[PDB]
Amino acid sequence: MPRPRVLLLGDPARHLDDLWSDFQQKFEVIPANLTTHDGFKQALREKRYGDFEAIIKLAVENGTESYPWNADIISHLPSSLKVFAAAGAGFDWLDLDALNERGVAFANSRGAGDTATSDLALYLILSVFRLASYSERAARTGDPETFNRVHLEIGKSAHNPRGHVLGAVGLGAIQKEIARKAVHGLGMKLVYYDVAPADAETEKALGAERVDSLEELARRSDCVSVSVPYMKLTHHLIDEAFFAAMKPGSRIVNTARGPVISQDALIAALKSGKLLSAGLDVHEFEPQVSKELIEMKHVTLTTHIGGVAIETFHEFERLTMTNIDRFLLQGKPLLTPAGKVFAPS
């Protein structure tokens, strides 16, 4: 045959050394040498990499200089192309429909960051219940008076998560782990809203109580956990109507996608006292954090580290290489497909 040709966007592997060596056994890996989005579309128009059968993206932050993967750039891929495999769950940067129209199969890396992301979210919930963020800022002043004033100030407002209600917006895979840790580890109760209902087992295992609308979920919650896929339909899913329905002095955390929560609404609900504290690992104008949120006492903000753990990367690398391996050499279907499903070689 003998060696199908894989285009690699950005870096080679950093963790699964043996598996990456076997992968290079097995396929001719062509480095993309990315410069500009435009430079890469020029490259594709000039047949610079030749015909190639697969594209591999080994990390979320790898290959970004090729973005966006819109119709226009996709119109230039060689027709030999069979499969594109990418790290990550989100593929906001990718027109999956333009890619499927060319008979190209897509695979993401769904599942790899579950443990990671659910942990960060557990960290956020801890943080907004105990006001730990404000606490750390005080400690880091290195000032004796501040340390004491704050240690006392926090005591008027901090609460154990235990017996308080976590309102899950979405009850997908990462929210199931989040829940299980809040319910069984921290002792919170669960109500959730979701497009579809959890099975008998998940509900009876987490004590999940479903409700019909977001407003209902808001009404019932002491802290809300947003964990939904991001799309047009989820943009500003969390807005003014939602904060108006929440209880005075409640809490919210986001590990899903920034613009799923209206930053302006959020800011307004903290200023008014509707929310006591909020925790964001994602930001509507990412990489720009809200200057107003920072400026506030009780808002925990992190640099999108939800899935950022070495084990997650181990899995991004495993799954991308395994998918291509399966789909081109083994005649097996993709392990983590997304969009239209094609036949293996």
Ligand X SMILES: NC(=O)c1ccc[n+]([C@@H]2O[C@H](COP(=O)([O-])OP(=O)(O)OC[C@H]3O[C@@H](n4cnc5c(N)ncnc54)[C@H](O)[C@@H]3O)[C@@H](O)[C@H]2O)c1
Residue set of the binding site: 173-174, 194, 228, 255-256, 281, 307
Whole-angstrom distance, CA of residue 153 vs CA of residue 170 = 34
Tell me: does residue 139 bind a copy of itself (CB under 8 A).
Answer: yes
286 annotated active-site: yes
Contacts 24+ apart (CB under 8 A), 138-141: none
304 annotated active-site: yes
- Contacted entry of ligand X, a copy of itself, none for residue 234, CB cut-off 5 to 8 Å set by kind: ligand X
- Contacted entry of a copy of itself, ligand X, none for residue 132, CB cut-off 5 to 8 Å set by kind: a copy of itself
Tell me: does residue 186 bind a copy of itself (CB under 8 A).
Answer: yes
Cβ neighbours around 285 below 10 Å, total: 10
Shortest distance in whole angstroms from residue 159 CB to a copy of itself: 5
When the beta carbons of 2 and 142 are compared against a copy of itself, the nearer one is: 142
Tell me: does residue 142 bind a copy of itself (CB under 8 A).
Answer: yes
Whole-angstrom distance, CA of residue 246 vs CA of residue 252 = 10
Q: Which one of 164, 220, 251, 257 is the catalytic residue?
A: 257
Task: Count CA atoms within 13 Å of residue 250 on its CB side.
Answer: 25
Crossing angle (nearest 10°) for helices 310-324 and 17-26? 20
- Contacted entry of ligand X, a copy of itself, none for residue 70, CB cut-off 5 to 8 Å set by kind: none
When the beta carbons of 168 and 338 are compared against a copy of itself, the nearer one is: 168
When the beta carbons of 66 and 234 are compared against ligand X, the nearer one is: 234
Whole-angstrom distance, CA of residue 104 vs CA of residue 119 = 35
DSSP, res 214: H
Shortest distance in whole angstroms from residue 257 CB to ligand X: 5
Q: Are 228 and 97 in contact (CB under 8 A)?
A: no
The interface region with a copy of itself, picked from 30-38, 147-155, 215-223, 258-266 by CB under 8 A, is: 147-155
Whole-angstrom distance, CA of residue 195 vs CA of residue 182 = 22
83-86: strand order across its sheet: 28-31, 5-8, 54-57, 83-86, 105-107
- With residue 198 as reference, give the H or E element that holds it: none
Whole-angstrom distance, CA of residue 204 vs CA of residue 100 = 39
When the beta carbons of 63 and 170 are compared against ligand X, the nearer one is: 170
Q: What are the catalytic residues?
A: 257, 286, 304
Residues of the shown chain interacting with a copy of itself in the complex, contacts defined by CB under 8 A: 61, 115-116, 119-120, 122-123, 126-127, 129-133, 135-140, 142, 144-145, 147-148, 150-152, 154-162, 180-181, 184-187, 286-291, 294, 300-305, 308-313
